[PDB]
Chain A
Amino acid sequence: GWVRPDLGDLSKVTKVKTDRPLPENPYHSRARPEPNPEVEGDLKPARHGSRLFFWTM
């Protein structure tokens, strides 16, 4: 008394059951590591203007 699985088999991704603990904190996952800080500030213009050699403005 069995079935003839014509087309429904080998498809339709399922879920099963919670059986064992899910392996969080995977295979190594050592560090990120840390990023470098940014600047937000306040966009002011040039302090006296382009300051190159003589170049007042």
Chain B
Amino acid sequence: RWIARTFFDGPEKNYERTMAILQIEAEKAELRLKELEVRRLMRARGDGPWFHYPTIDKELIDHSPKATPDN
């Protein structure tokens, strides 16, 4: 009789801790099933800036009437 309430508890702490730390899982094992959804299969679209590769900067073009009309 004087062992439990001196030391520990029953189905009020070790239950609903199982219900507690098993809600840190469905936002962990499911976001890890979105990286494979997105990173490996992005793929040919390249919409989200992960496969964004630099090509050229069009700022350095010129527009003056350069001295040959047919160029």
A51–B47 touching, CB < 8 Å: no
Say whether B31 contacts A47, CB under 8 Å: yes
| Contacting residues, chain B, for A37 (C-beta < 8 A) | 47
Count residues of A near B (Cβ-Cβ below 8 Å).
6
Per-residue CB contact flags for chain A residues 28-57 toward chain B (1 = under 8 Å, else 0) read 000000001101000000011001000000
Q: What is the CB-to-nearest-CB distance from B25 to chain A, in angstroms, rounded to a whole number?
A: 10
Alpha-carbon gap, A36 to B28, bound state (A): 30
Total cross-chain contacts (CB, 8 A)? 13
A32 to chain B, nearest CB (A): 11
Check B32 for interface membership: any CB of A closer than 8 A.
yes
Residue in B27, B46, B47 whose CB lies within 8 Å of A48: B27
User: B46 contacts A36, CB within 8 Å?
Assistant: yes
Cβ contacts under 8 Å, B44 to chain A:
none
Alpha-carbon gap, A51 to B46, bound state (A): 24
Please provide the 10 A-B residue pairs with the shortest distance between their CB atoms, ordered closest to farther: A36-B47, A48-B27, A51-B28, A47-B27, A48-B28, A51-B31, A48-B24, A51-B32, A47-B31, A37-B47
